[PDB]
Amino acid sequence: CKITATPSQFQPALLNASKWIWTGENPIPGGSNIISTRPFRKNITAPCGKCSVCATIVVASDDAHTFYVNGVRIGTGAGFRQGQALFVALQPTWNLFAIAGQNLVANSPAGIMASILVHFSDGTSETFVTDESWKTLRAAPPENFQLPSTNDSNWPSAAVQGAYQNSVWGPPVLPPVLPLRGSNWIWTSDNVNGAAPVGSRAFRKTVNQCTKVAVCATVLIAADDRYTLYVNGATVGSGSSYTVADAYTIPNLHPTFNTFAINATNGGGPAGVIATILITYSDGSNETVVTDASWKAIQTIPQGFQPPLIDEFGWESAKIIGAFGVAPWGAGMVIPSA
Ligand SMILES: *[C@@H]1O[C@H](CO)[C@@H](O[C@@H]2O[C@H](CO)[C@@H](O)[C@H](O)[C@H]2NC(C)=O)[C@H](O)[C@H]1NC(C)=O
Ligand SMILES: *[C@@H]1O[C@H](CO)[C@@H](O[C@@H]2O[C@H](CO)[C@@H](O)[C@H](O)[C@H]2NC(C)=O)[C@H](O)[C@H]1NC(C)=O
Ligand SMILES: *[C@@H]1O[C@H](CO)[C@@H](O[C@@H]2O[C@H](CO)[C@@H](O)[C@H](O)[C@H]2NC(C)=O)[C@H](O)[C@H]1NC(C)=O
Ligand SMILES: C[C@@H]1O[C@@H](O)[C@H](O)[C@H](O)[C@H]1O
Ligand SMILES: C[C@@H]1O[C@@H](O)[C@H](O)[C@H](O)[C@H]1O
Ligand SMILES: [Ca+2]
Ligand SMILES: [Ca+2]
């Protein structure tokens, strides 16, 4: 229950050990199936002596899926060529994962594949996957099939349709951990006419939903020249590339108030910092924060620019240099896989 895990480099959930599953209505795996919707459930328990905190999920489907965690709809998606990234807070000892899969083309294959990378309170992680231990039904999902109160003890086992490397679908591409589409390159307002002075600049963003309980954050960040990233005053990481982005996991968020602070440095010419942050809440919801004009910025970095509760007098609104994609940096940022 005590969280000794600390901020770390983001660890990708992989699909390599995962299996495609369906109902087995057609006993040929990868065989033709009817248009239909089918349920899939798995109760996963935390190993002895650890608490589960949150999970990075990658899910792929032929043809479409709706993903639930402990009764809460977490995401909807479709397609088997590229997986979908989802993030969710978890109960400490067990968690019910439920998926409604849909086959949308008659006489065509059908399948659900997911990988669930659970992070534990002690800083360790374990991947769980769709396989034959999941429960299903040869029928449309009952009402409230995804709720933990539904009893699945008399459900049949899911039928494996294929493996990551051996299936009709081939191996799905991992999505990026988080999008940079939707974020902006920002800087202090001394950034004009495509260049900014040499020097360091600081940026701050606070999230404070005092009626919710925040659990984990995933951060994706890049800066033209370099950055150091802080959360609630603690150093998270640093980078020096505007073509290869860095991803971090913050597993020990404060429950209600969290401040992200950045020291970014321009070595000459253009400058900018860009980031996308996803925070998970204990009720299963999430929120995304992006670098934009709601961040604060300052041109001379004061002592203790990174502590959570400083006086922000004399900080300006950060300037939007451009949405992700603009010249000179373009759209080709290398982003870690989800
Ligand atoms: C965060 O939670 C929300 C809902 O709880 C999810 O976003 C909405 O639901 C669908 C499901 O993927 C999104 O595609 C839409 O963009 C959202 N609805 C809108 C805009 O009306 C989202 O899946 C969750 N993110 C996670 C779990 O990473
Ligand atoms: C998932 O599994 C856990 C553990 O097997 C279930 O939790 C147990 O439920 C029984 C019956 O209510 C309790 O007596 C135990 O104390 C619980 N054990 C633990 C470790 O919590 C849980 O009910 C299952 N969830 C679902 C949705 O089936
Ligand atoms: C902000 O970042 C810059 C660069 O990362 C820091 O400036 C460096 O300070 C180190 C001390 O560790 C010195 O060795 C160098 O003079 C600087 N290096 C570079 C590359 O500029 C700066 O101290 C950071 N913090 C603040 C508050 O400005
Ligand atoms: C793999 C196959 O591809 C197309 O025919 C359709 O997407 C169909 O639903 C799917 O099963
Ligand atoms: C886009 C531009 O490219 C070079 O001039 C340098 O790497 C500089 O730091 C960067 O801003
Ligand atoms: Ca299909
Ligand atoms: Ca530069």
Coordinates of C-alpha atoms and ligand atoms in Angstrom, one line a residue:
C1 CA 0.0 0.0 0.0
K2 CA 3.0 2.3 0.6
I3 CA 4.4 3.4 -2.8
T4 CA 8.2 3.3 -2.9
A5 CA 8.3 3.4 -6.7
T6 CA 9.8 6.7 -8.0
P7 CA 9.8 8.5 -11.4
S8 CA 11.5 6.4 -14.0
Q9 CA 12.0 6.1 -17.8
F10 CA 8.7 4.9 -19.3
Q11 CA 8.6 1.1 -19.8
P12 CA 6.7 0.1 -22.9
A13 CA 4.0 -2.5 -22.8
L14 CA 4.7 -5.0 -25.5
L15 CA 2.4 -7.4 -27.4
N16 CA 5.1 -10.1 -28.1
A17 CA 3.7 -12.5 -25.4
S18 CA 0.0 -11.7 -26.1
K19 CA -2.6 -13.9 -27.9
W20 CA -5.6 -13.1 -30.1
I21 CA -8.8 -14.5 -28.6
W22 CA -12.4 -15.0 -29.7
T23 CA -15.2 -17.4 -28.8
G24 CA -14.3 -20.5 -30.8
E25 CA -17.7 -20.5 -32.5
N26 CA -15.6 -21.3 -35.5
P27 CA -13.1 -23.9 -34.1
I28 CA -10.6 -22.9 -36.9
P29 CA -8.4 -20.1 -35.4
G30 CA -8.4 -17.1 -37.7
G31 CA -11.4 -18.6 -39.5
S32 CA -14.5 -17.0 -40.8
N33 CA -16.9 -15.7 -38.1
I34 CA -20.3 -14.0 -38.2
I35 CA -21.1 -10.4 -37.5
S36 CA -21.5 -10.4 -33.8
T37 CA -20.5 -8.8 -30.5
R38 CA -18.8 -10.9 -27.8
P39 CA -17.7 -10.4 -24.2
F40 CA -14.3 -11.2 -22.6
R41 CA -13.4 -11.0 -18.9
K42 CA -10.3 -11.6 -16.8
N43 CA -10.0 -11.1 -13.0
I44 CA -6.3 -10.4 -12.3
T45 CA -5.0 -10.4 -8.8
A46 CA -1.9 -8.7 -7.4
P47 CA 0.9 -11.1 -6.5
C48 CA 1.6 -11.7 -2.8
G49 CA 3.0 -8.7 -0.9
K50 CA 2.6 -6.0 -3.7
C51 CA -0.2 -3.6 -4.4
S52 CA -1.0 -2.8 -8.0
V53 CA -1.1 1.0 -8.7
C54 CA -1.8 1.6 -12.4
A55 CA -1.4 0.0 -15.9
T56 CA -0.2 0.8 -19.4
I57 CA -2.5 -1.0 -21.8
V58 CA -2.1 -1.8 -25.5
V59 CA -5.2 -3.3 -27.3
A60 CA -5.9 -4.3 -30.9
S61 CA -9.0 -5.8 -32.4
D62 CA -10.6 -7.3 -35.5
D63 CA -12.7 -5.4 -35.9
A64 CA -13.5 -3.1 -32.9
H65 CA -13.4 -3.1 -29.1
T66 CA -14.6 -1.4 -26.0
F67 CA -12.3 -1.7 -23.0
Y68 CA -13.5 -1.7 -19.3
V69 CA -11.6 -1.7 -16.0
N70 CA -13.6 -2.6 -12.8
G71 CA -16.8 -1.6 -14.6
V72 CA -15.5 1.8 -16.0
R73 CA -15.3 2.4 -19.8
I74 CA -11.7 3.3 -20.4
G75 CA -11.5 3.4 -24.2
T76 CA -13.0 2.4 -27.6
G77 CA -11.0 1.6 -30.7
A78 CA -10.7 -0.6 -33.8
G79 CA -8.2 -2.2 -36.0
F80 CA -5.4 -4.8 -35.9
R81 CA -2.6 -3.2 -37.8
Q82 CA -1.8 -0.8 -34.9
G83 CA -2.6 -1.1 -31.3
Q84 CA -4.3 1.5 -29.1
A85 CA -2.7 2.9 -25.9
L86 CA -4.8 3.2 -22.8
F87 CA -3.8 4.2 -19.2
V88 CA -5.7 3.5 -16.0
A89 CA -5.5 3.5 -12.2
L90 CA -6.0 0.2 -10.5
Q91 CA -7.4 -1.3 -7.3
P92 CA -4.7 -2.5 -5.0
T93 CA -5.3 -6.3 -5.0
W94 CA -7.6 -7.4 -7.8
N95 CA -8.8 -5.8 -11.0
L96 CA -11.6 -7.0 -13.5
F97 CA -10.7 -6.3 -17.1
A98 CA -13.6 -6.6 -19.6
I99 CA -13.6 -6.2 -23.3
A100 CA -16.5 -6.1 -25.7
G101 CA -15.2 -7.2 -29.2
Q102 CA -17.1 -6.8 -32.4
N103 CA -16.8 -8.6 -35.7
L104 CA -18.1 -6.2 -38.4
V105 CA -17.6 -8.1 -41.7
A106 CA -19.4 -11.3 -42.4
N107 CA -17.3 -14.5 -43.1
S108 CA -14.2 -12.7 -41.7
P109 CA -11.8 -13.4 -38.9
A110 CA -12.4 -12.0 -35.4
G111 CA -10.2 -11.4 -32.5
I112 CA -9.1 -9.3 -29.5
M113 CA -5.5 -8.9 -28.4
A114 CA -4.3 -6.9 -25.4
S115 CA -1.3 -6.5 -23.2
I116 CA -1.7 -5.1 -19.6
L117 CA 1.5 -3.8 -18.0
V118 CA 0.7 -3.5 -14.3
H119 CA 3.0 -1.3 -12.1
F120 CA 3.2 -2.2 -8.5
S121 CA 3.8 -0.1 -5.3
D122 CA 7.4 -1.4 -4.9
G123 CA 8.5 -0.3 -8.4
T124 CA 8.2 -3.6 -10.1
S125 CA 6.0 -4.5 -13.1
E126 CA 4.4 -7.5 -14.7
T127 CA 2.7 -7.9 -18.1
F128 CA -0.7 -9.7 -18.3
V129 CA -2.2 -10.7 -21.7
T130 CA -5.3 -12.0 -23.4
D131 CA -5.2 -15.8 -23.6
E132 CA -7.2 -18.9 -23.0
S133 CA -7.6 -18.1 -19.3
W134 CA -10.1 -15.3 -20.2
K135 CA -13.8 -16.0 -20.0
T136 CA -16.2 -15.4 -22.9
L137 CA -19.7 -16.2 -24.1
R138 CA -21.0 -17.6 -27.4
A139 CA -23.7 -14.8 -27.3
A140 CA -24.1 -11.1 -27.2
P141 CA -22.7 -9.5 -24.0
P142 CA -25.3 -9.6 -21.1
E143 CA -26.3 -6.2 -19.6
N144 CA -23.6 -5.1 -17.2
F145 CA -21.2 -7.9 -18.3
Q146 CA -18.3 -5.7 -17.5
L147 CA -19.3 -5.0 -13.9
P148 CA -17.4 -6.9 -11.1
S149 CA -20.7 -8.0 -9.6
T150 CA -21.5 -10.1 -12.7
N151 CA -20.6 -13.8 -12.0
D152 CA -18.6 -15.3 -14.9
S153 CA -17.9 -18.6 -13.2
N154 CA -20.1 -20.5 -15.7
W155 CA -18.6 -18.7 -18.7
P156 CA -16.5 -20.8 -21.2
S157 CA -12.9 -20.1 -21.8
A158 CA -11.8 -17.9 -24.6
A159 CA -10.4 -19.6 -27.7
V160 CA -7.0 -18.5 -29.0
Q161 CA -7.1 -17.3 -32.6
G162 CA -3.3 -16.8 -33.0
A163 CA -0.1 -15.5 -31.4
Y164 CA 1.8 -12.3 -31.9
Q165 CA 4.1 -13.8 -34.5
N166 CA 1.8 -16.6 -35.8
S167 CA -1.7 -15.4 -36.8
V168 CA -3.7 -14.2 -39.8
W169 CA -3.2 -10.6 -38.6
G170 CA 0.6 -10.4 -38.3
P171 CA 2.2 -8.4 -35.5
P172 CA 0.4 -5.1 -34.7
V173 CA 2.6 -2.0 -34.6
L174 CA 2.8 -0.4 -31.2
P175 CA 1.3 3.1 -31.1
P176 CA 3.3 6.0 -29.7
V177 CA 3.2 6.2 -25.9
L178 CA 1.4 9.6 -26.2
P179 CA 0.6 11.9 -29.1
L180 CA 2.4 15.1 -29.8
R181 CA -0.4 16.0 -32.2
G182 CA -2.5 18.3 -29.9
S183 CA 0.5 19.8 -28.1
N184 CA 2.4 23.0 -28.9
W185 CA 6.0 24.1 -29.0
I186 CA 6.2 26.8 -26.3
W187 CA 8.8 29.3 -25.1
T188 CA 9.1 32.6 -23.4
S189 CA 8.0 35.6 -25.3
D190 CA 11.6 36.6 -26.2
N191 CA 11.2 33.9 -29.0
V192 CA 10.5 36.1 -32.1
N193 CA 11.1 35.8 -35.9
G194 CA 12.1 32.1 -35.6
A195 CA 14.9 32.5 -33.1
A196 CA 15.3 33.1 -29.4
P197 CA 18.2 34.3 -27.2
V198 CA 20.8 31.9 -25.9
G199 CA 19.9 30.9 -22.3
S200 CA 17.7 28.9 -20.0
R201 CA 14.0 29.5 -19.5
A202 CA 11.6 27.9 -17.0
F203 CA 8.0 26.7 -17.5
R204 CA 5.4 25.6 -14.9
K205 CA 2.0 23.8 -15.0
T206 CA -0.1 22.8 -12.0
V207 CA -2.9 20.3 -12.0
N208 CA -5.2 20.4 -9.0
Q209 CA -8.5 18.5 -9.1
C210 CA -9.2 18.6 -5.4
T211 CA -12.3 16.4 -5.6
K212 CA -10.4 13.5 -7.3
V213 CA -7.5 11.2 -6.4
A214 CA -4.6 11.3 -9.0
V215 CA -2.5 8.2 -9.2
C216 CA 0.0 8.0 -12.1
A217 CA 1.3 10.3 -14.8
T218 CA 3.0 9.5 -18.1
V219 CA 5.0 12.4 -19.6
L220 CA 6.3 12.7 -23.2
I221 CA 8.7 15.7 -23.7
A222 CA 11.2 17.2 -26.1
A223 CA 13.0 20.5 -26.2
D224 CA 14.9 22.4 -28.8
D225 CA 18.3 22.0 -27.4
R226 CA 17.6 20.6 -23.9
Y227 CA 15.5 20.4 -20.8
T228 CA 15.3 19.2 -17.2
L229 CA 11.9 18.1 -16.0
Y230 CA 10.7 18.3 -12.3
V231 CA 7.5 17.0 -10.6
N232 CA 6.7 18.5 -7.2
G233 CA 10.3 19.7 -7.0
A234 CA 11.8 16.2 -7.6
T235 CA 14.0 15.7 -10.6
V236 CA 12.3 13.3 -13.1
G237 CA 14.8 13.4 -16.0
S238 CA 16.5 15.4 -18.7
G239 CA 17.1 15.3 -22.4
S240 CA 19.1 17.1 -25.1
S241 CA 17.3 16.1 -28.4
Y242 CA 14.5 17.8 -30.3
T243 CA 14.3 14.8 -32.7
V244 CA 14.0 12.0 -30.2
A245 CA 11.4 12.5 -27.4
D246 CA 11.7 11.2 -23.9
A247 CA 8.9 9.4 -22.0
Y248 CA 8.6 9.1 -18.2
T249 CA 6.3 7.4 -15.7
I250 CA 5.5 9.1 -12.4
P251 CA 4.0 6.4 -10.2
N252 CA 3.8 8.4 -7.0
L253 CA 1.7 11.4 -7.7
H254 CA 0.4 13.5 -4.9
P255 CA -3.4 12.7 -4.7
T256 CA -4.7 16.2 -5.5
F257 CA -1.9 18.8 -6.3
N258 CA 1.0 18.2 -8.8
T259 CA 3.3 20.8 -10.4
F260 CA 5.3 20.1 -13.5
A261 CA 8.3 22.4 -14.0
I262 CA 10.8 22.5 -16.8
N263 CA 14.2 24.2 -17.2
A264 CA 14.7 24.3 -21.0
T265 CA 17.9 25.8 -22.5
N266 CA 18.5 27.3 -26.0
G267 CA 22.0 26.9 -27.3
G268 CA 21.3 29.3 -30.3
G269 CA 18.8 29.8 -33.0
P270 CA 15.2 28.5 -32.7
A271 CA 13.9 27.3 -29.4
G272 CA 10.9 25.5 -28.0
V273 CA 9.7 22.8 -25.5
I274 CA 6.8 20.5 -26.1
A275 CA 5.1 18.0 -23.9
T276 CA 2.0 15.8 -23.4
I277 CA 1.0 14.6 -19.9
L278 CA -1.6 12.0 -19.1
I279 CA -2.8 11.7 -15.4
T280 CA -4.9 8.7 -14.3
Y281 CA -7.5 9.1 -11.6
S282 CA -8.7 6.4 -9.1
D283 CA -12.2 6.6 -10.5
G284 CA -10.9 5.3 -13.8
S285 CA -11.0 8.7 -15.6
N286 CA -7.9 10.5 -16.9
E287 CA -6.9 13.9 -18.1
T288 CA -4.4 15.1 -20.7
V289 CA -2.3 18.2 -20.3
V290 CA -0.3 19.7 -23.2
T291 CA 2.2 22.5 -23.4
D292 CA 0.1 25.6 -24.4
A293 CA -0.4 29.2 -23.3
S294 CA -1.9 28.1 -19.9
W295 CA 1.6 27.3 -18.8
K296 CA 3.6 30.0 -17.0
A297 CA 7.1 31.0 -18.2
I298 CA 9.9 33.2 -17.0
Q299 CA 13.1 34.5 -18.7
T300 CA 15.4 34.7 -15.7
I301 CA 15.0 31.5 -13.7
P302 CA 14.6 32.3 -10.0
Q303 CA 15.9 30.2 -7.1
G304 CA 13.4 27.4 -6.4
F305 CA 11.6 27.7 -9.8
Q306 CA 10.7 24.0 -9.4
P307 CA 9.0 23.8 -5.9
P308 CA 5.2 23.3 -6.0
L309 CA 4.0 26.3 -4.1
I310 CA 6.1 29.3 -5.2
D311 CA 4.9 32.8 -5.9
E312 CA 4.2 33.0 -9.6
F313 CA 4.1 36.8 -9.7
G314 CA 6.3 38.0 -12.6
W315 CA 5.8 34.8 -14.6
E316 CA 4.2 35.3 -18.0
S317 CA 1.8 33.1 -20.0
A318 CA 4.0 30.9 -22.1
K319 CA 4.1 31.8 -25.8
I320 CA 2.8 29.3 -28.4
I321 CA 5.6 29.0 -31.0
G322 CA 3.4 26.6 -33.1
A323 CA 1.4 23.5 -32.9
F324 CA 3.3 20.2 -33.2
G325 CA 4.5 19.8 -36.8
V326 CA 5.5 23.4 -37.6
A327 CA 8.9 24.1 -39.1
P328 CA 11.7 24.0 -38.2
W329 CA 11.2 20.8 -36.3
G330 CA 8.5 19.1 -38.4
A331 CA 6.4 16.1 -37.7
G332 CA 9.1 13.3 -37.5
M333 CA 9.8 13.2 -33.8
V334 CA 10.8 9.7 -32.7
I335 CA 8.3 8.8 -29.9
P336 CA 8.7 5.8 -27.6
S337 CA 6.3 2.9 -28.2
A338 CA 3.3 2.6 -25.8
Ligands
LIG1 C1 -9.5 8.8 -21.0 O1 -10.9 8.7 -20.6 C2 -11.8 9.0 -21.7 C3 -13.1 8.6 -21.2 O2 -13.1 8.1 -19.9 C4 -11.4 8.3 -23.1 O3 -11.7 9.4 -24.0 C5 -13.0 9.5 -24.6 O4 -13.5 8.2 -25.1 C6 -13.0 7.7 -26.3 C7 -12.5 6.3 -26.1 O5 -11.2 6.1 -26.7 C8 -12.0 8.6 -26.9 O6 -11.5 8.1 -28.2 C9 -12.6 10.0 -27.1 O7 -11.6 10.9 -27.6 C10 -13.1 10.6 -25.8 N1 -14.5 11.0 -25.9 C11 -14.8 12.2 -26.5 C12 -13.7 13.1 -27.0 O8 -16.0 12.5 -26.7 C13 -10.0 7.9 -23.2 O9 -9.9 6.6 -23.9 C14 -9.2 7.7 -21.9 N2 -7.7 7.7 -22.2 C15 -6.9 6.7 -21.8 C16 -7.6 5.6 -21.0 O10 -5.8 6.7 -22.1
LIG2 C1 -11.2 -11.3 -8.2 O1 -10.5 -12.2 -7.3 C2 -10.4 -11.8 -6.0 C3 -9.5 -12.8 -5.3 O2 -9.7 -14.1 -5.6 C4 -11.8 -11.7 -5.3 O3 -11.7 -11.2 -4.0 C5 -12.1 -12.1 -3.0 O4 -13.5 -12.2 -2.8 C6 -13.9 -13.1 -1.8 C7 -15.4 -13.3 -1.9 O5 -16.1 -12.0 -1.8 C8 -13.5 -12.5 -0.4 O6 -13.9 -13.4 0.6 C9 -12.0 -12.4 -0.4 O7 -11.6 -11.7 0.7 C10 -11.5 -11.6 -1.7 N1 -10.0 -11.7 -1.8 C11 -9.2 -10.7 -2.1 C12 -7.8 -11.0 -2.1 O8 -9.7 -9.6 -2.3 C13 -12.7 -10.8 -6.2 O9 -14.0 -10.8 -5.7 C14 -12.7 -11.2 -7.7 N2 -13.4 -10.2 -8.4 C15 -14.3 -10.5 -9.4 C16 -14.9 -9.4 -10.1 O10 -14.5 -11.7 -9.7
LIG3 C1 19.1 25.1 -16.1 O1 19.8 24.4 -17.2 C2 21.1 24.9 -17.5 C3 21.7 23.9 -18.5 O2 21.2 22.6 -18.2 C4 22.0 25.0 -16.2 O3 23.3 25.6 -16.6 C5 24.4 24.7 -16.3 O4 24.8 24.8 -15.0 C6 25.8 23.8 -14.8 C7 25.8 23.4 -13.3 O5 25.4 22.1 -13.2 C8 27.1 24.5 -15.2 O6 28.2 23.5 -15.2 C9 27.0 25.1 -16.6 O7 27.5 26.5 -16.5 C10 25.6 25.1 -17.3 N1 25.6 24.3 -18.4 C11 24.9 24.6 -19.6 C12 25.0 23.6 -20.7 O8 24.4 25.7 -19.7 C13 21.3 25.8 -15.1 O9 22.1 25.8 -13.9 C14 20.0 25.1 -14.9 N2 19.3 25.7 -13.7 C15 19.0 27.0 -13.6 C16 18.2 27.3 -12.3 O10 19.2 27.8 -14.5
LIG4 C1 -8.8 -9.2 -41.7 C2 -10.2 -8.8 -42.3 O1 -10.0 -7.6 -43.1 C3 -11.2 -7.2 -43.7 O2 -11.8 -8.2 -44.6 C4 -12.1 -6.7 -42.7 O3 -11.5 -5.7 -41.8 C5 -12.5 -7.9 -41.8 O4 -13.4 -7.5 -40.8 C6 -11.2 -8.5 -41.2 O5 -11.5 -9.6 -40.4
LIG5 C1 16.8 24.1 -35.6 C2 18.2 24.4 -35.1 O1 19.1 23.6 -35.7 C3 20.4 24.0 -35.4 O2 20.6 25.4 -35.8 C4 20.7 23.8 -33.9 O3 20.6 22.5 -33.6 C5 19.7 24.7 -33.1 O4 19.9 24.4 -31.7 C6 18.3 24.4 -33.6 O5 17.5 25.4 -33.0
CA6 CA -13.5 -9.2 -39.0
CA7 CA 18.2 26.0 -30.6

